[PDB]
Symmetry: C2
Subunit: 77 residues, 2 copies
């Protein structure tokens, strides 16, 4: 699989909202939210999905009233 | 599925994943490590919540590396699973 760290979300963003956003690019297996819900760890089934989602969403303001979201690839070891 | 995630930030520049395992293995069985290079951050997983809490308490806001300011460790909430 692959994994992403997503930050600069609006405070209070729901895991459901993250799932909907990231499900367009792959099969989301798990989401961990970080308090106060302005960042999240997103796990995908396929290696390719994190790369495609990052290309789609990184540095874009996908939420109203808020700046661009940051999407970082989590490099496994 | 399941398990606890720590988001670790303000690592010294050039900190490797092997160094991170060494540091976090003091508090339990590290399950996985991901590096957020080129940023000085990482993600550390433990299967046990109590290991993650103890690690977070021991390391958050602690200058654990020489000649470097305090490392940050944030425990994520329990995950949602979609499988």
């Amino acid at each position: 699989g692959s994994m992403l760290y997503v930050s600069n979300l609006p405070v209070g963003t729901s895991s459901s909202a993250i799932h909907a956003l990231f499900s367009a690019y792959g099969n989301v297996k798990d989401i961990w939210m970080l308090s106060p819900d302005n960042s999240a760890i997103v796990s995908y089934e396929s290696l390719s999905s994190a790369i495609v989602a990052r290309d789609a969403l990184h540095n874009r303001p996908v939420f109203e009233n808020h700046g661009p979201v940051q999407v970082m690839l989590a490099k496994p070891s």
